[PDB]
Design a protein around this nucleic acid. Structure first.
Ligand SMILES: [Mg+2]
Ligand SMILES: [Mg+2]
Ligand SMILES: [Mg+2]
Ligand SMILES: [Mg+2]
Ligand SMILES: [Mg+2]
Ligand SMILES: [Mg+2]
Ligand SMILES: [Mg+2]
Ligand SMILES: [Mg+2]
Ligand SMILES: [Mg+2]
Ligand SMILES: [Mg+2]
Ligand SMILES: [Mg+2]
Ligand SMILES: [Mg+2]
Ligand SMILES: [Mg+2]
Ligand SMILES: [Mg+2]
Ligand SMILES: [Mg+2]
Ligand SMILES: [Mg+2]
Ligand SMILES: [Mg+2]
Ligand SMILES: [Mg+2]
Ligand SMILES: [Mg+2]
Ligand SMILES: [Mg+2]
Ligand SMILES: [Mg+2]
Ligand SMILES: [Mg+2]
Ligand SMILES: [Mg+2]
Ligand SMILES: [Mg+2]
Ligand SMILES: [Mg+2]
Ligand SMILES: [Mg+2]
Ligand SMILES: [Mg+2]
Ligand SMILES: [Mg+2]
Ligand SMILES: [Mg+2]
Ligand SMILES: [Mg+2]
Ligand SMILES: [Mg+2]
Ligand SMILES: [Mg+2]
Ligand SMILES: [Mg+2]
Ligand SMILES: [Mg+2]
Ligand SMILES: [Mg+2]
Ligand SMILES: [Mg+2]
Ligand SMILES: [Mg+2]
Ligand SMILES: [Mg+2]
Ligand SMILES: [Mg+2]
Ligand SMILES: [Mg+2]
Ligand SMILES: [Mg+2]
Ligand SMILES: [Mg+2]
Ligand SMILES: [Mg+2]
Ligand SMILES: [Mg+2]
Ligand SMILES: [Mg+2]
Ligand SMILES: [Mg+2]
Ligand SMILES: [Mg+2]
Ligand SMILES: [Mg+2]
Ligand SMILES: [Mg+2]
Ligand SMILES: [Mg+2]
Ligand SMILES: [Mg+2]
Ligand SMILES: [Mg+2]
Ligand SMILES: [Mg+2]
Ligand SMILES: [Mg+2]
Ligand SMILES: [Mg+2]
Ligand SMILES: [Mg+2]
Ligand SMILES: [Mg+2]
Ligand SMILES: [Mg+2]
Ligand SMILES: [Mg+2]
Ligand SMILES: [Mg+2]
Ligand SMILES: [Mg+2]
Ligand SMILES: [Mg+2]
Lengths: 8, 114, 118, 209, 123, 56
RNA sequence: GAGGACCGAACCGACUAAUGUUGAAAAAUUAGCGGAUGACUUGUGGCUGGGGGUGAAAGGCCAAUCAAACCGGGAGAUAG
RNA sequence: CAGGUGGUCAGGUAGAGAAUACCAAGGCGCUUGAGAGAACUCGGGUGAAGGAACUAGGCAAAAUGGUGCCGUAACUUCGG
RNA sequence: UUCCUUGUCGGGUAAGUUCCGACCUGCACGAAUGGCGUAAUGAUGGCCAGGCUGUCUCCACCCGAGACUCAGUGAAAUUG
RNA sequence: GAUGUCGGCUCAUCACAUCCUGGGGCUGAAGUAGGUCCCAAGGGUAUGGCUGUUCGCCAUUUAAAGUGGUACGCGAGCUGGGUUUAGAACGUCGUGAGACAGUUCGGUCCCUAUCUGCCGUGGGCGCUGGAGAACUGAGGGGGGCUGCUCCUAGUACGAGAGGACCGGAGUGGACGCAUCACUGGUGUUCGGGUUGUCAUGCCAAUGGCACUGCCCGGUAGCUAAAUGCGGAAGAGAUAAGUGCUGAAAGCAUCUAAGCACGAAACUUGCCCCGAGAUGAGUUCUCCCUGACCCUUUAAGGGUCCUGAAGGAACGUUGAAGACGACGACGUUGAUAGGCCGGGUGUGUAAGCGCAGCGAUGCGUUGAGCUAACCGGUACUAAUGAACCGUGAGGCUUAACCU
């Protein structure tokens, strides 16, 4: 999973 | 439904003349301007006929003052006083809806002659 | 909704339905009894019995209307030479449906459909 | 006031003399035979029970046939009750015909509405559809949200959802009576009444003004 | 059956040629204007020396529709296009002096008797 | 979506409490063979309501 | 009868949308899309090796593995 | 396993054509069926009056589309 | 590239934080890590109009494949 | 060892600190129209331009365009414009790698529902012999909006301008239910035209395929844009408020005793559901009236004979329907198919013949064909049976009859 796409 | 056709067969007009699509027909209708009562004429080409007994109708198209006007008449309605054919036309169809996109000399209809 | 509608779709489109009932009506005219499913046999009466009504008056135009609906000259010949004179004094009801068991491969309810004087 | 049991024959049109067409529904009201009278001593309320039509004698059960033979009337297709007012009296065996409505001006008609089967929320509750384009993923006639988050954490009762539509008892009120034809057992009311052609209708005088 | 963004023809000699309906008046969430109804319009096309100019915000009454009118016997009168007559914003009186084409008998009211008198034909 | 707890063998038998099959009660006897068959169906030996309908 | 010319099939690509997303498929189908005589495209063989290659440059690609491939050893690294 | 894989052969009617439609020689109906004719999803057809008012955005859909001839503006590196 | 800022003025619209033209107060442009123009090109970013339409007002009906029922075979994630 | 997130869309629900509609007091309230406070939550409470915007400014309406809560409601319901990892550029900061609530173009949105819940629809058993019907109605839900024009009347009030209260009539907007008679949409199951090609030996006539090949009309059903109906009046008890009589307090005082008014809120009146209302109700009708054996003795068990009223199953099916269910019918029959007559639609078939060089035209001929429609007709299928369901229905008291 490419978790860094989640906008923080 | 013998019941409904008995109720409808006693309301139908008995002197409706013969016409077909393509004919030029003058229709005289009752108008009431206030409380006196007159007849007015609508003369044009029959473009559609619906046949349902008491629910019969026909559509008349005419050009009025440079404007296209269509009128659906209920045939057995007592507003319509008389129907009269002025000219018999020769067409191949039952519905002349293609006359809506034609104007002037493109809208001529041949007389049947036979 | 479905109110007052006629005809069975039978999980086909319309041109497959028409080709299937032309073949089935030709096989019933040929062999005079076939085995099919029960809904196909019920939908076949509204196909086969008008052809037998059409064959009760012989004319060139009725042969051509039967050829247009069957596309087989052997079927039109048997309709107009044999089946017409058989049923000449019968007002409808030319076939008869007999229910039979279930098809082994899919549990389909099967039925025979025959002609009445077979 | 009591009413009558009829049958929907269908719709037609009546032309009037000034050239106005009136849409009418034709209701056949044959004579209603009173089969039982109820009162406050035995039943706790005042009412009559009527029947109409006919039935195959092999389709009438023995309890129904004994109930019709005790009254002395012929067996109809069903049984309906009407609450009596104070000062109205009838006797068992009396026939009531459509000339009861000869001076009635407006009526209420009750029938069983037409069955639509399982209906979605667009048809059943006039819900708005979502976008036909612009990215919509498989959600064109779906109902949308059905509640709120953790508070309350449930769906409320009476939430408008898909389900059985139609096929239920409906009353239309205050319909103009156009014509009462006693010779052919007819009653003509203006407008449309619930149900399909051939269904049973209950025609009462109007409760309002 | 006129709603917003509908283009209408102009049936008088006020100077305008094309108008656009920008409000159907007389009620909240009101959808349509048939024959006889006042609408608010803006002028899209005009003749070079008319009474009105392009971009004016005026009132108008609908006199002809393609959807048509209905008669108490069930009859229908349809037309080939949609037309309106321009009115003053406050007096709601006609701007032009002639009327072109036929009109119907739904305009027969105290508000629009100058239209009824000026019309070449009333159907 | 999936269960959060394992359903019991009791809830499984309660769900399967409508799964039982219906035996045919109606076996008719044909009036010339005397053999059983379904109602409104032909027999195994090709009779129906007293007559030989298929000679097979 | 020139052209990194033009329209357009094969052939090579991958811009949009729907679908699928325990897929028919660990990157696809459908309908539209770009190039299509050239800095084109492709079969057969060969050469370049891991702090190394190759890169019309994206830290891209080097056997579904890449800001240092894989396999075996040091090795039971070390882990407040 | 709706994906991938180089070369060779190239009929008829229409067509500029190895495009497309229908056919020949040749080969196939793609290894679950049978019913019914609900919501809702997928792929399509048609739509009164209106006509981008939808939306972040004319996304998607609709539309245009061939041959011959007449005719064609600003601008320009004189080719367009 | 401009924070203040939707700067101010003109145009286009009934109504324009976007666009186009212009001003100059350039927080914080500028000359080969180029300045400023520029025909032709672009599955490039933005904006306006005509055609066209189920995008929409406001959805209706139809045709197919599923969903439903009968027979056969028969998964999965999760689970104190 | 993961509680997805700004705005919109769909769908809401609640509060009341009320935007409109209803009722009142004061006004520096002449009337119209305002201000301000008190009561009141039944219903209702814009469309567009700009922008990702929520807001805001603006255009034009409306009776009015309410303020908040609900994970700043709602992504296992949708979008993905804002924000937005990896690409790239600008301004700027740093020698630099790089950095920036500075900007800009681009940038993968998974889940077949076990449980609670909600919407619908069935099976079981209970309701005390069984069965078939019609009800009463504890309780529950739906619904409740409003403009304008006219008469009272150019009356009240006002210098004039202007312009009412109360009350009555009509006609609209939004919303809801029903229906298909009318106007229309659809109508791949009816008719016709037509391009290409293939076939039926050939001419003629037809059929397959090309999105139903492209089209033009259209039956029934379904339907809205079509056309009928609706919100009530009335009654009870009240909110704020206004009062009658009346003392404590010789007066006064709406209140403490007694008495009356008083609103879209409340309870009813309108519509629907409703006896699993386990408190399981009522009324009407219908069927069943044989003999033995044993045990541990009681609402006992077993045996042969009996099988009702009614039901279910099977079949033909439906304006009923996902499946169940519900409705009509099964030869004492119109239930479906077919057939017969009518209708409706399309629009003058084929064959033959005559005119023409020919394509074509004309006569036969408003012809032929015609789905779901209407009225008829036992020609086809709806079977003689079998199956479930029993054999008078507990105990105690009370009142009448014997
Ligand atoms: Mg039927
Ligand atoms: Mg299937
Ligand atoms: Mg139904
Ligand atoms: Mg979709
Ligand atoms: Mg847990
Ligand atoms: Mg099961
Ligand atoms: Mg080139
Ligand atoms: Mg090219
Ligand atoms: Mg692609
Ligand atoms: Mg493709
Ligand atoms: Mg291409
Ligand atoms: Mg980099
Ligand atoms: Mg490298
Ligand atoms: Mg790789
Ligand atoms: Mg290292
Ligand atoms: Mg270790
Ligand atoms: Mg070591
Ligand atoms: Mg394969
Ligand atoms: Mg290849
Ligand atoms: Mg090809
Ligand atoms: Mg397969
Ligand atoms: Mg379907
Ligand atoms: Mg389309
Ligand atoms: Mg349309
Ligand atoms: Mg249109
Ligand atoms: Mg817009
Ligand atoms: Mg909008
Ligand atoms: Mg596009
Ligand atoms: Mg400006
Ligand atoms: Mg500028
Ligand atoms: Mg620079
Ligand atoms: Mg320099
Ligand atoms: Mg320099
Ligand atoms: Mg330079
Ligand atoms: Mg450009
Ligand atoms: Mg714009
Ligand atoms: Mg299933
Ligand atoms: Mg199975
Ligand atoms: Mg956890
Ligand atoms: Mg308050
Ligand atoms: Mg006040
Ligand atoms: Mg915008
Ligand atoms: Mg939220
Ligand atoms: Mg959620
Ligand atoms: Mg974004
Ligand atoms: Mg996007
Ligand atoms: Mg952005
Ligand atoms: Mg999603
Ligand atoms: Mg997706
Ligand atoms: Mg739970
Ligand atoms: Mg209530
Ligand atoms: Mg009709
Ligand atoms: Mg029509
Ligand atoms: Mg059609
Ligand atoms: Mg052909
Ligand atoms: Mg020929
Ligand atoms: Mg073929
Ligand atoms: Mg085809
Ligand atoms: Mg083919
Ligand atoms: Mg009831
Ligand atoms: Mg009970
Ligand atoms: Mg008879």
């Amino acid at each position: 999973g490419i978790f860094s796409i989640f906008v923080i | 439904s013998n019941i409904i056709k008995q109720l409808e067969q006693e309301q139908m007009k008995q002197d409706v003349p013969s016409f077909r699509p393509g004919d030029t027909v003058e229709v005289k209708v009752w108008v009431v301007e206030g409380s006196k009562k007159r007849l007015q004429a609508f003369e044009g080409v029959v473009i559609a006929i619906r046949n349902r007994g008491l629910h019969s109708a026909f559509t008349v198209r005419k050009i009025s003052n440079g404007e296209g006007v269509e009128r659906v008449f209920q045939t057995h309605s007592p507003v319509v006083d008389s129907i009269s054919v002025k000219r018999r036309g020769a067409v191949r169809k039952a519905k002349l809806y293609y006359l809506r996109e034609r104007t002037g000399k493109a809208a001529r209809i041949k007389e049947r002659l036979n | 909704m479905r109110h007052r509608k006629s005809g069975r779709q039978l999980n086909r489109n319309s041109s497959h339905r028409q080709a299937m009932f032309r073949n089935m009506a030709g096989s019933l005219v040929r062999h005079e009894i076939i085995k099919t499913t029960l809904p196909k046999a019920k939908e076949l009466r509204r196909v086969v019995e008008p052809l037998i009504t059409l064959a009760k008056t012989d004319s060139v135009a009725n042969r051509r209307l039967a050829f247009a609906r069957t596309r087989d000259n052997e079927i039109v010949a048997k309709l107009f030479n044999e089946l017409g004179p058989r049923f000449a004094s019968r007002a409808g009801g030319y076939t008869r449906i007999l229910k039979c068991g279930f098809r082994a491969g899919d549990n389909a309810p099967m039925a025979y459909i025959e002609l009445v004087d077979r | 006031m009591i009413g009558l049991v009829g049958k929907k024959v269908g719709m037609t049109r009546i032309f009037t003399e000034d050239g106005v067409s009136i849409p009418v529904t034709v209701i056949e009201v044959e004579a209603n035979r009173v089969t039982q009278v109820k009162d406050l001593a035995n039943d706790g309320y005042r009412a009559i029970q009527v029947t109409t039509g006919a039935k195959k004698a092999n389709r009438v059960t023995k309890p129904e046939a004994g109930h019709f033979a005790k009254a002395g009337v012929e067996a109809g297709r069903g049984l309906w009750e009407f609450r009596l007012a104070e000062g109205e009296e009838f006797t068992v065996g009396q026939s009531i015909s459509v000339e009861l409505f000869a001076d009635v001006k407006k009526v209420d008609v009750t029938g069983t509405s037409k069955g639509k089967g399982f209906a979605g929320t667009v048809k059943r509750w006039n819900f708005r559809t979502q976008d036909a384009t612009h990215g919509n993923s498989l959600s064109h006639r779906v109902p949308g949200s059905i509640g709120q988050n953790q508070t309350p954490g449930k769906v409320f009762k009476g939430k408008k959802m898909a389900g059985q539509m139609g096929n239920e008892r409906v009353t239309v009120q205050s319909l103009d009576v156009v014509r009462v034809d006693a010779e052919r057992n007819l009653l003509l009311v203006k407008g449309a009444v619930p149900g399909a052609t051939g269904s049973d209708l209950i025609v009462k005088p109007a409760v309002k003004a | 059956m006129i709603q917003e963004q509908t283009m209408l023809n102009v049936a008088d000699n006020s100077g305008a040629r094309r108008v656009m309906c920008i409000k159907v008046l007389g009620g909240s969430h009101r959808r349509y204007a048939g024959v006889g109804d006042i609408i608010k319009i803006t002028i899209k096309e005009a003749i070079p020396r008319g009474k009105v100019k392009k971009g004016d915000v005026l009132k108008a009454v609908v006199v002809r529709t393609k959807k048509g009118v209905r008669r108490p016997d069930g009859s229908v009168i349809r037309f080939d296009g949609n037309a309106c007559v321009l009115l003053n914003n406050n007096s709601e009186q006609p701007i032009g002096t002639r009327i072109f084409g036929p009109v119907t008998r739904e305009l027969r009211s105290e508000k629009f008797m100058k239209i009824i008198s000026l019309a070449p034909e009333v159907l | 979506a999936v269960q959060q707890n394992k359903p019991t063998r009791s809830k499984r038998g309660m769900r399967r409490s409508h799964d039982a099959l219906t035996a045919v009660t109606s076996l008719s006897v044909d009036k010339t063979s005397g053999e059983k068959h379904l109602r409104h169906h032909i027999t195994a030996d090709g009779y129906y309501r007293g007559r030989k309908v298929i000679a097979k």
